[PDB]
Amino acid sequence: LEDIPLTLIINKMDRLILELKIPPTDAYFKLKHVIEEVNTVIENTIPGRGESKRLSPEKGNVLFACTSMGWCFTLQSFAKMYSESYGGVNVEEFARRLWGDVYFNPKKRTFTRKPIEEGAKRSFVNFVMEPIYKLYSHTISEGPEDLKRTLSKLGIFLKPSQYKADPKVLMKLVCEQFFGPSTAFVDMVIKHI
Amino acid sequence: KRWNLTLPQMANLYRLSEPLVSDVVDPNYFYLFELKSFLTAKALNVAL
Amino acid sequence: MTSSIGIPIKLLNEAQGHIVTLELTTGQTYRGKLIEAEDNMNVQLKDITVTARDGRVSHLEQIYIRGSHVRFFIVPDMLRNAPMFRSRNV
Amino acid sequence: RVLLPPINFLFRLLQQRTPVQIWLYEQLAIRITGVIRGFDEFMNLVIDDAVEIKLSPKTNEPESKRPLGQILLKGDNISLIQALSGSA
Amino acid sequence: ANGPLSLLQTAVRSHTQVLISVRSGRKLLARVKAFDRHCNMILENVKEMWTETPVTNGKKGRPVNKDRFISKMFLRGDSVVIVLLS
Amino acid sequence: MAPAQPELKKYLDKRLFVELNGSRRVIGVLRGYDVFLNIVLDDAVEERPNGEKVKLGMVTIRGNSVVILEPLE
Amino acid sequence: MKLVRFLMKCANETVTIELKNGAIVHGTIASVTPKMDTALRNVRYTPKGEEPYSVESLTVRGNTIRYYILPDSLPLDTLLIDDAPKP
Amino acid sequence: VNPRPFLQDLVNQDVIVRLKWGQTEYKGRLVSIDSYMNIQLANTEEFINYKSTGHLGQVLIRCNNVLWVTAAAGKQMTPTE
Amino acid sequence: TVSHEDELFGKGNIEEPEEEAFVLPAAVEPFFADEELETEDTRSAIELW
Amino acid sequence: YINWRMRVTLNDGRQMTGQMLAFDKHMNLVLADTEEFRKTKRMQAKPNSSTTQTLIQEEKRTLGLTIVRGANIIALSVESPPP
Numbered sequence: 073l074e075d076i077p078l079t080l081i082i083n084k085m086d087r088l089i090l091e092l093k094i095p096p097t098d099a100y101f102k103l104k105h106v107i108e109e110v111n112t113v114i115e116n117t118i119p120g121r122g123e124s125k126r127l128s129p130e131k132g133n134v135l136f137a138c139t140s141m142g143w144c145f146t147l148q149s150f151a152k153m154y155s156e157s158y159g160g161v162n163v164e165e166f167a168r169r170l171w172g173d174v175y176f177n178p179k180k181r182t183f184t185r186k187p188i189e190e191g192a193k194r195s196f197v198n199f200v201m202e203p204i205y206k207l208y209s210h211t212i213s214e215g216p217e218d219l220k221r222t223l224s225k226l227g228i229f230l231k232p233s234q235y236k237a238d239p240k241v242l243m244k245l246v247c248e249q250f251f252g253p254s255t256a257f258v259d260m261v262i263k264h265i
Numbered sequence: 266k267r268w269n270l271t272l273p274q275m276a277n278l279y280r281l282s283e284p285l286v287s288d289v290v291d292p293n294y295f296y297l298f299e300l301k302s303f304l305t306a307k308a309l310n311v312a313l
Numbered sequence: 314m315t316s317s318i319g320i321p322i323k324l325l326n327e328a329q330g331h332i333v334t335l336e337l338t339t340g341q342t343y344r345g346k347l348i349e350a351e352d353n354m355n356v357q358l359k360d361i362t363v364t365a366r367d368g369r370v371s372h373l374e375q376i377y378i379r380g381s382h383v384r385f386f387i388v389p390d391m392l393r394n395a396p397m398f399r400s401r402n403v
Numbered sequence: 404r405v406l407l408p409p410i411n412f413l414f415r416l417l418q419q420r421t422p423v424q425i426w427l428y429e430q431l432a433i434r435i436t437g438v439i440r441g442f443d444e445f446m447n448l449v450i451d452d453a454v455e456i457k458l459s460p461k462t463n464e465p466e467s468k469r470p471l472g473q474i475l476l477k478g479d480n481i482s483l484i485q486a487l488s489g490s491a
Numbered sequence: 492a493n494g495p496l497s498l499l500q501t502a503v504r505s506h507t508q509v510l511i512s513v514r515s516g517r518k519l520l521a522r523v524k525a526f527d528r529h530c531n532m533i534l535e536n537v538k539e540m541w542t543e544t545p546v547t548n549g550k551k552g553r554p555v556n557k558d559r560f561i562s563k564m565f566l567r568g569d570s571v572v573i574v575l576l577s
Numbered sequence: 578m579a580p581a582q583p584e585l586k587k588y589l590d591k592r593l594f595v596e597l598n599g600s601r602r603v604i605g606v607l608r609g610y611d612v613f614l615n616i617v618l619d620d621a622v623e624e625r626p627n628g629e630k631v632k633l634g635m636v637t638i639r640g641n642s643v644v645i646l647e648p649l650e
Numbered sequence: 651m652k653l654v655r656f657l658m659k660c661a662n663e664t665v666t667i668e669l670k671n672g673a674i675v676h677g678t679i680a681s682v683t684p685k686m687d688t689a690l691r692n693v694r695y696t697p698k699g700e701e702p703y704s705v706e707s708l709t710v711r712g713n714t715i716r717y718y719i720l721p722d723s724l725p726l727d728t729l730l731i732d733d734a735p736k737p
Numbered sequence: 738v739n740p741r742p743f744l745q746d747l748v749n750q751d752v753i754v755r756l757k758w759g760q761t762e763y764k765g766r767l768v769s770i771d772s773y774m775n776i777q778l779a780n781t782e783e784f785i786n787y788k789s790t791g792h793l794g795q796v797l798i799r800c801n802n803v804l805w806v807t808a809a810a811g812k813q814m815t816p817t818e
Numbered sequence: 819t820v821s822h823e824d825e826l827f828g829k830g831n832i833e834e835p836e837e838e839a840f841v842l843p844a845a846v847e848p849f850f851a852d853e854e855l856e857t858e859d860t861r862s863a864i865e866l867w
Numbered sequence: 868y869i870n871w872r873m874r875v876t877l878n879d880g881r882q883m884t885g886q887m888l889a890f891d892k893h894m895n896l897v898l899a900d901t902e903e904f905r906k907t908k909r910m911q912a913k914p915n916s917s918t919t920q921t922l923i924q925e926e927k928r929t930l931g932l933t934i935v936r937g938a939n940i941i942a943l944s945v946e947s948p949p950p
């Protein structure tokens with residue numbers, strides 16, 4: 073009503089992973105439920121102008137964060153970590169194609185709306201949420217040698233004393249070295265505020 | 266003077282300690298039944 | 314291994330939005346507010362007040378210069394004390 | 404819109420066999436006119452029936468011509484390749 | 492091992508004098524001692540020749556062929572313009 | 578790794594003047610580019626120092642050949 | 651073999667390098683980089699048409715140099731011995 | 738026809754290469770071609786300003802100083818008027 | 819009014835339109851592609867959490 | 868070799884003296900408190916002497932914080948150590 077520009081920060085994703093323990097597709101459904109609830113009350117505040125101030129992850133004004141472990145990312149920043157780890161990926165178009173009812177066919181290497189190859193999951197799920205779930209599960213579920221092997225396979229290096237830490241502090245260190253700092257939040261604020 | 270135990274060992278020790286170990290997960294279980302509440306009730310001459 | 318960009322390229326990237334003066338290898342120096350930067354030092358400027366060493370003073374808008382022809386670049390003094398220059402000792 | 408990649412443009416020019424005039428690198432008065440026959444990843448173009456034209460330094464008109472036949476020019480010596488559209 | 496590197500290796504093994512025309516307007520008659528993949532060369536008993544135009548009292552005279560002798564020389568492959576094995 | 582592509586998406590399909598070596602000017606409309614700054618433009622007009630504009634149509638300039646660029650719109 | 655390894659084995663010696671710009675610097679080499687960048691101590695440099703200048707040290711990039719001449723007593727056979735491991 | 742196949746077919750045959758410096762030409766039997774477009778030729782003769790400077794023999798030329806290359810069969814070294 | 823799936827694809831095109839047809843390079847995979855989602859100790863890990 | 872007061876020679880003959888702050892892999896050097904000195908040879912002819920004297924006049928301009936690409940960088944020499 074005061075027309076201050078508004079951006080969304082979905083918080084406490086560890087509750088999706090560790091409290092609710094819902095599968096990654098249900099995590100996507102929960103995320104979309106929260107985002108549509110926010111946009112629904114935005115639309116009901118002023119009728120007819122809900123499209124002007126739409127909050128949705130593909131625009132870059134929704135930042136998924138877990139503040140206990142201390143990581144935050146947008147879709148653009150997550151595609152940026154893809155572009156850093158592999159190279160030659162258009163971050164803007166990929167972040168556009170990440171969210172929604174977009175399904176990823178790996179054999180055709182394409183984006184559709186129905187599963188063409190009979191088992192293709194969502195683009196957001198397959199590229200974003202299942203890596204986070206696998207990171208969480210393998211960080212709290214593996215011994216220190218297996219953890220060292222896995223995190224070195226991705227490229228994350230820790231001092232050997234830190235591999236034997238408590239699960240919560242080890243989790244914080246692993247997520248800190250994986251996601252990195254809060255640059256995604258800075259980008260979100262600069263672009264949308 | 267210091268110990269570290271793997272996840273299977275800690276899980277097994279947690280399972281063996283069932284008759285004693287506490288099943289409370291939520292801290293909101295201790296609403297108005299914590300130390301600060303007892304000290305407030307002591308200072309006010311009331312008893313929860 | 315992880316690719317490490319240079320500190321000077323990082324200082325160029327952090328100079329966006331402030332007025333800088335870029336002198337190319339052709340003897341022409343343009344001073345203006347930088348609007349973008351790239352890892353290959355291909356910078357685009359908006360204010361671009363150009364002075365050519367033959368004595369040609371002019372003004373242009375939205376001029377992009379590749380890093381190959383760029384000879385020298387001078388940025389604002391505040392970036393002299395930037396967070397990049399601190400020696401991180403972990 | 405649809406972007407035109409330089410490799411796609413070179414492939415279209417080779418498939419259409421259209422005439423191309425290339426002003427050389429560091430030489431505004433030196434051009435090569437021919438038909439594109441093949442291209443490589445290092446921008447080295449082999450062109451059949453190539454003719455080298457040296458332009459006049461004053462009036463910027465073609466002064467001398469010499470047909471070198473089917474030749475090959477590296478990408479480092481090529482500056483400006485323009486497709487001369489034939490009057491069909 | 493089969494292109495111009497083979498010819499350079501053969502010239503180095505034969506210790507035959509070859510003439511290298513360098514893009515700074517120079518010529519070098521020398522025996523090849525060592526070579527690299529980037530055309531970097533190390534040679535022994537090098538005679539370097541050049542043409543210098545003497546300008547005496549503002550008048551450009553006839554050019555003179557100046558020559559110098561170097562025991563060991565190292566020439567980069569970037570500055571090499573032409574090479575001829577003799 | 579692979580070099581980053583130049584930021585010229587906003588410059589696509591727009592009137593642009595490119596200054597290239599030999600003090601040459603090209604006024605045209607951007608049609609495409611590459612990672613190595615190989616620019617392909619349509620309706621190109623070449624200008625020498627004499628101020629004469631010669632139409633060429635579809636032209637291509639290499640990354641090393643391109644020196645400066647400026648949007649005309 | 652790598653000529654950079656030979657140049658590193660040829661370091662700590664007094665040489666004279668003429669660059670592509672016509673400047674010639676003579677002095678004792680202090681360090682040699684794998685990209686042929688050589689830093690020399692007790693340098694005396696002469697540019698194209700300028701008077702010579704003596705400096706304590708001078709670093710020249712591996713791209714700007716044109717031709718280097720070392721002393722005649724250099725053990726070229728010893729410096730050309732293959733010491734790197736076979737890949 | 739790719740430039741690599743053209744250079745492979747031009748091997749063991751007379752070719753003329755025009756350099757980028759001094760407008761010099763070298764006509765001779767091409768012997769060896771490398772992946773970096775390094776040329777080694779035999780029975781090479783050099784010409785400067787459309788005038789034959791003379792035969793040199795086995796000539797090794799790097800790709801940096803080479804401007805254009807063509808077949809020497811049916812090609813006249815004199816400049817057309 | 820303007821759906822994301824409609825502005826990205828176009829009504830009922832389902833697949834991407836062939837004029838653009840964005841594809842990823844062959845190297846690009848999800849980060850923990852080979853690693854399975856759930857170790858046999860993950861139940862125990864969240865029970866101890 | 869950082870934080871040492873040095874003078875670098877450009878490919879165009881211009882000298883730049885200042886405190887070297889940072890260097891990169893491609894020798895692109897960022898230096899602060901830069902002073903660009905150009906030694907231009909000028910033939911000054913006196914009104915009484917017919918022989919024109921060629922003097923290397925040094926024109927110095929302060930630039931401040933400047934980053935220079937390594938392709939145009941030629942050589943550098945240390946002037947003064949850390950202060």
Ligand SMILES: Nc1nc2c(ncn2[C@@H]2O[C@H](COP(=O)(O)OP(=O)(O)OP(=O)(O)O)[C@@H](O)[C@H]2O)c(=O)[nH]1
Binds near residue numbers: 141
């Ligand atoms: N699972 C999970 N719990 C969190 C996270 N962040 C905070 N918490 C817990 O949630 C509680 C609330 O955190 P606060 O930082 O106090 O939130 P707040 O916004 O300051 O609370 P108010 O200012 O009163 O609205 C804390 O006590 C934490 O224990 C998180 O990222 N994940």
